[PDB]
Amino acid sequence: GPLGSRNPGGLQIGDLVNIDLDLEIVQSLQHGHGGWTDGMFETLTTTGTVCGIDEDHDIVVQYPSGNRWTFNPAVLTKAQFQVGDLVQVCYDLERIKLLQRGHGEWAEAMLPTLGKVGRVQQIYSDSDLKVEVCGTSWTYNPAAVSKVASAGSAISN
Secondary structure, three states: OOOOOOOOOOOOOOOEEEOOOOHHHHHHHHOOOOOOOHHHHHHHHOOEEEEEEOOOOOEEEEOOOOOEEEEOHHHOEEOOOOOOOEEEEOOOHHHHHHHHOOOOOOOHHHHHHOOOEEEEEEEOOOOOEEEEEOOEEEEEOHHHEEEOOOOOOOOOO
16 A cells, blocks of 8 residues: 555564655654654654654654654654774765865765764774764765764663
8 A cells, every 4th residue: 555554553562664765755744743852863764663652643763873753644654982882873975075174085986874873993093083874984074973862861661
């Protein structure tokens, strides 16, 4: 069936989902189903894990960055630093192109890394970083990435 024809309850916690859609369509469908913020660019290139269904029947999805985002079910398709640090790549394409000048440069094959998390593999003497993002390592300006706190502040049970 077409987009939106999935049976309610056809996704459960632990299911893997992706987004195949263009941003503009995601934004339309997100109206009244949680909206869009640019922090969500991760979701267009990362496989998420269903972690809940809210009262209004929208799907809450968990990302390796630690972030959880709420989606219209129709959007989803069922599927300073230290070495080892989990870091998130800047999602702003314009900014990152400028930061990458002289710091490893921007290659178009890096486009999917926007907004994604990866792992620091090596820190160069001049402070640039080798970061592995979904199996491929790139050189980044450290200003082009942020240390990730998965869950953030501690919450008592």
